[PDB]
Design an enzyme around this catalytic site. Structure first.
Site, PDB file in Angstrom:
ATOM      1  N   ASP A 134      45.992  64.646  34.562  1.00 18.81           N
ATOM      2  CA  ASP A 134      47.018  65.446  35.222  1.00 18.81           C
ATOM      3  C   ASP A 134      46.994  66.884  34.668  1.00 18.81           C
ATOM      4  OD1 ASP A 134      49.471  66.017  36.785  1.00 18.81           O
ATOM      5  OD2 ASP A 134      50.382  66.048  34.797  1.00 18.81           O
TER       6      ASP A 134
ATOM      7  N   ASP B  48      52.110  62.893  32.646  1.00 21.59           N
ATOM      8  CA  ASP B  48      53.408  63.067  32.002  1.00 21.59           C
ATOM      9  C   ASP B  48      54.619  62.606  32.814  1.00 21.59           C
ATOM     10  OD1 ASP B  48      52.865  65.450  33.692  1.00 21.59           O
ATOM     11  OD2 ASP B  48      54.807  66.148  32.925  1.00 21.59           O
TER      12      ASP B  48
END
Ligand SMILES: [Mg+2]
Length: 272
Positions: free
Chosen positions: A25, A216
């Site tokens: 990510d 996250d």
């Protein structure tokens, strides 16, 4: 809760694996959350760390982001060894390829006409509601109706979508706070993750023997879950959330901050 990522265990499998797959990510993972997201231009340290990781041909390094094609192209694209997934999976660039693929234009988008007709039906029944179209997703918003009557119609709408549209087309029906969204499955980060593993082929000897998957928030949880169902040996796969030790997650490990993520990759880069 999860244990802190065991760097010794990570390094051992890295050294042992013949091919390796990294799925990162971007925001909140490689780079810190900031007040202005046009800020969040990646630091030279992030770029240098990624450049070095992707320079080893044993490594497949992917950046998976909601950011526009223009952003990734400009700030990442100058490292041609990086695989890029932009606008949530709508545009994909394979590593070492100069060739962006538009997944929207190569998939069956006939589902949008049907979903629009369904949404139009419930919009006519539900004062306060309206339709929002984005380039690949369609959303029916009903926050402005009475909450009870709104949820009554949203239950009927979802049922109609699931039993008709979602059987004929590869789409997902998602309930948000006071909305229903329909979107192709290729926009789901878990779909992306499973596909990256699948692209190695059917020869089980050809599957990567090291996979590090990092993210996250709740959109990344989809990747972690996908990897659990991938069929890869568990000791080969490290799904890691970025956040507190107390964070509920489908990941197996955590790292507290993006600085710790960059620090972990740097360790791998200094494996020699
Ligand atoms: Mg993020």
């Amino acid at each position: 809760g999860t244990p802190a990522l065991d760097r010794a265990k990570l390094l051992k499998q890295y050294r042992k694996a013949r091919k390796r797959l990294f799925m990162f990510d971007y925001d909140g993972t490689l780079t810190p959350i900031v007040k202005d997201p046009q800020a969040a231009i990646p630091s030279d340290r992030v770029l240098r760390t990624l450049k070095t990781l992707a320079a080893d041909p044993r490594n497949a390094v992917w950046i998976i982001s909601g950011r526009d094609q223009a952003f990734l192209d400009e700030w990442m694209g100058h490292i041609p060894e990086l695989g890029l997934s932009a606008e949530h999976g709508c545009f994909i660039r394979q590593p070492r390829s100069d060739d962006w693929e538009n997944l929207a234009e190569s998939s069956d988008m006939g589902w949008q006409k049907e979903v629009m007709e369904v949404f139009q039906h419930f919009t006519e029944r539900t004062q306060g509601s309206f339709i929002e179209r984005k380039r690949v997703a369609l959303t029916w918003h009903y926050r402005r109706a009475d909450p009870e009557y709104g949820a009554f119609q949203a239950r009927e709408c979802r049922k109609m979508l699931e039993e008709t549209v979602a059987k004929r087309w590869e789409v997902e029906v998602m309930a948000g706070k006071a909305n229903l969204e329909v979107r192709p499955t290729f926009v789901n980060k878990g779909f992306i993750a499973a596909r990256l593993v699948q692209e190695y082929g059917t020869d089980p000897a050809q599957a990567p023997e090291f996979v590090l998957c990092l993210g996250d928030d709740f959109t990344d949880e989809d990747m972690f879950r996908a990897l659990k169902k991938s069929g890869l040996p568990a000791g080969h796969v490290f799904s890691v959330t970025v956040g507190a030790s107390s964070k509920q997650t489908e990941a197996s490990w955590h790292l507290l901050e993006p600085a710790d993520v960059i620090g972990t990759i740097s360790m791998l880069n200094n494996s020699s």
